[PDB]
Amino acid sequence: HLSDMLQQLHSVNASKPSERGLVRQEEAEDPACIPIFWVSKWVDYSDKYGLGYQLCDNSVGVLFNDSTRLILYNDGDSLQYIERDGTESYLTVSSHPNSLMKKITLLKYFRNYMSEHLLKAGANITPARLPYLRTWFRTRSAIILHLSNGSVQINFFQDHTKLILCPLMAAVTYIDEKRDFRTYRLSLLEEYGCCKELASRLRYARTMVDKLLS
């Protein structure tokens, strides 16, 4: 889906949407395309262990340094372990192999840290296969998060704005600096235009999706 996302972003950025004669950004809004899943908190502990994260349904996950993943569902008991080749296993906290005790303990450490310290992004949105974090990286400006359902999320450090790109819907959700959450069809952004701030962030997103492709 990354190449589809790249093509969608190219088409919208090529149209120079902030130069529309009259920009009508609101006409591009499509609340039906609001994503089900996004990353609502995260902690990069990759100097030792890896990247812990919360999804907006309050499930939590870790992408460990060895490229395995452990997901704890929002019931607090169901687990999914994903090996580095994508092989999935389904377990529980109450019945799991002893070989996973260290990673379960680490996941619990991340879950508790994020609960005690970090603000939930998108908490104002009222509530599908649960995705896992496929890969991530940071730049000077942002963290880029690639989920296994094809979504790409980009969180900008300076001003707290966020994009959630969904190539299946050809849509982008933008959370602005006031924490207002709006979802747009990319083709309608091409038609109706958008403000310079969003246009600028969609240009940066194309660059970031390009880096993911490699």
Binding site: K41, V43, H117, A121, N155
Partner: peptide, 5 residues
Amino acid sequence: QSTXL
């Protein structure tokens, strides 16, 4: 880390 509460 993401942002603080």
